[PDB]
Ligand SMILES: NS(=O)(=O)c1ccc(NC(=O)NS(=O)(=O)c2ccc(Cl)cc2)cn1
């Protein structure tokens with residue numbers, strides 16, 4: 001599977017039949033149809049003790065990985081019951097500034113989307129959590145092209161060292177608080193992983209406020225490769241799944 005003509009999102013269902021399931025992600029967020037749920041709590045993002053370890057090009061995106069063997073960087077509150085530990089973040093992005101995000105807002109596509117992936121500590125580890133309907137919480141943040149995001153630059157500058165699939169680099173002391181927007185207002189709905197295995201284990205929390213990144217920053221994302229070293233160059237771009245049917249779901253808003 002991948003994002004090409006012959007192995008892209010429209011093909012995934014053949015190996016991953018859940019691709020046509022009842023709670024697939026991403027979705028379009030119709031802002032007028034989302035309903036304010038006054039009982040939704042403010043989100044608690046507690047990243048002060050985060051321990052980043054490594055950055056990896058996995059052939060479909062790059063993951064910044066964290067130590068999730070203790071409650072160091074956690075997400076709580078909002079729609080969530082209990083404590084969700086940060087395991088990794090990654091992005092999805094386009095070949096052009098007018099596409100790249102997975103979620104859309106009133107059909108608007110952003111240039112990219114950041115996913116901070118967390119797992120519910122009552123399930124003990126990530127592999128068990130993905131087998132549960134409330135196993136994961138993914139915090140989604142839109143990126144638009146404008147001013148640079150200073151907190152992103154340390155990521156941008158290491159990408160040369162992980163150009164190709166399977167490459168990793170040490171990536172300690174990275175503070176993911178530098179990727180957050182000012183407001184934590186969000187939409188939330190039950191969904192899935194957006195890449196195979198497409199498991200229906202995610203509480204999605206998608207922030208309303210995008211972060212701005214510069215054209216130079218996103219250009220560096222687009223220099224990455226899907227291929228391994230010594231293989232024909234295929235630029236890592238358009239690694240996003242399009243919006244999937246909402247089916248029997250309501251998107252809730254934390255704000256009016
Ligand atoms: N929804 S998402 O944030 O883009 C997202 C999609 C897919 C994944 N997939 C993922 O972690 N795959 S994996 O590491 O190979 C893996 C690991 C363990 C299991 Cl049990 C299943 C899959 C993570 N986040």
Ligand SMILES: [Zn+2]
Nearest residue numbers: 090092115194
């Ligand atoms: Zn993702």
